[PDB]
Amino acid sequence: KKKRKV
Amino acid sequence: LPQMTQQLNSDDMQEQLSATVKFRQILSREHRPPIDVVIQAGVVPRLVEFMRENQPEMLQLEAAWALTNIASGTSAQTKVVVDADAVPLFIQLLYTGSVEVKEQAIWALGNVAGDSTDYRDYVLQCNAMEPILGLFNSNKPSLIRTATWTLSNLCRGKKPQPDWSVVSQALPTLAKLIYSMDTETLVDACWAISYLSDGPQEAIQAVIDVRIPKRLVELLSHESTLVQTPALRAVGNIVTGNDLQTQVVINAGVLPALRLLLSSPKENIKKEACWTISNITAGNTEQIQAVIDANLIPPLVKLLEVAEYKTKKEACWAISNASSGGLQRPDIIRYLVSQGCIKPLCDLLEIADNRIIEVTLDALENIIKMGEADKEARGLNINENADFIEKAGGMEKIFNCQQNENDKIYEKAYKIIETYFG
Amino acid sequence: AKKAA
Incomplete structure (x- = not known):
């Protein structure tokens, strides 16, 4: 999976 | 910009x-x-x-x-x-x-x-x-x-x-x-x-x-299914190996932990729990007894008769693999029969797919061989288990599998009817 | 009779 830095 | x-x-x-x-x-x-x-x-x-x-x-x-x-x-x-x-x-x-x-x-x-x-x-x-x-x-x-x-x-x-x-x-x-x-x-x-x-x-x-593995087992009883899911997936992968590798997991107290997982509200968890149990009943005679002593057969039989198909499927294997060790310990078969797996087993033939029909017929067959070997010893006129299968409506269903397109199945079916219902 | 996946 992938994750975005918010 | x-x-x-x-x-x-x-x-x-x-x-x-x-x-x-x-x-x-x-x-x-x-x-x-x-x-x-x-x-x-x-x-x-x-x-x-x-x-x-x-x-x-x-x-x-x-x-x-x-x-x-x-x-x-x-x-x-x-x-x-x-x-x-x-x-x-x-x-x-x-x-x-x-x-x-x-x-x-x-x-x-x-x-x-x-x-x-x-x-x-x-x-x-x-x-x-x-x-x-x-x-x-x-x-x-x-x-x-x-x-x-x-x-x-x-x-x-x-x-x-x-x-x-x-x-x-x-x-x-x-x-x-x-x-x-x-x-x-x-x-x-x-x-x-x-x-x-x-x-x-x-x-x-x-x-x-x-x-x-020992820790991995303690984690099966965590309260978040987020921990239970991956932990069960690894435990299950281990019992995939040889008997010795599987004993390491039985010794870590995994069986009592699986008894609980069968009650899991999460469906895919009940499934994999049965899957794991089935790879352990695929081991030696002692390991099959370990499962019987842990008291996993009863809940297994219940799921065998009422779970979703993808779960019954796994319960079937577990119980079927257990019947194998019946050649060595005739009592295993007796226990299994005493717990009422025959009726749920026969009924599965009616909705199962080809591969599960083979597993079910092998189990019914092992169950039948023992009940036959007893007709001899105890000097019985009839085959107790055979009469049980006729009751559950198993006989009719086994008979229908003679029209199955798969060779392995119809051949297995005729042999059973011939050998035990003539 | 050992099943993997």
Whole structure:
């Protein structure tokens, strides 16, 4: 999976 | 804005940091990040420079941040960053950078290694594992939580599987990670262990030697099914190996733990619990008795008759494999029959698919052979089990399997009817 | 009779 830095 | 791009390419240090910050800000919105627009400005390679050795640490952190989010898009978008040679630089930042910087780098690497088995392997071949294992010697939970997730992507993949000589090295660390208080970390460490367990006997032995299984079992009784799911998947993968490797897990008290999982409200959990149990009843006579003594047969029979198909399917195997050890211990069969598996077994023939019909007919057949061997000894006129199967309506259904297109089945069916119902 | 996946 992938994750975005918010 | 074009103004931003101009700045980013300025020789003026200050104007560059201002631009990297602005660029990173619009990729960190809460909404739809304009990834393509940014890529189109042609700034990616320019941001990759800012992660070099001599660059100010602030400029490195910022740049990596923007780049990590660009890498959180599609495979097409992640390729732009990988084609710019960002990977080798992210890795050197794991060594030299501050903690904030490392945090960003391991995150970026997480997205790249998560795109494809190719990138997963590329990151591994750039020797990222060495510095990554070193991140765990820190006290900061956040950093350790991201490193655990990233590690998970590196181990994941069973189509082309990851280089075993490399990933196998993370076992000792994982071993500790499964005692963490942090749920997110804990969860990902288990998934990682389960990925390393979906392999050959060599892999199963490694997990066993680093003494993971006993803990893995204690984790089956955690209250979050987020921990229960990956923990069960690894435990199940272990009992896939030979008898000795499977005894290590029986000895860790896994059977009593499985008795509970059968009541799990989560359907896929009931399934895999049956799956695991079935690979243990596929072992020696003693292991089959262990299962019987744990008192797993009764609940198994209940699911065999009322669970969803994908679960009954597994219950069937478990019970069927058990019937095998009936040649050696005639009582196993007696026990099974006394618990009422015949009726639920016969009824399954009516809705099962070809492969499950074979497993059911083998079980019914083993059950029948014993009841026949008893007609002899005890000197009975009839075959007790045979009469049981006629009652449940099993006989009629077995008879219908003679019209099944599959040779293995219809042949098996005629033999049963001939041999036991003439 | 050992099943893997």
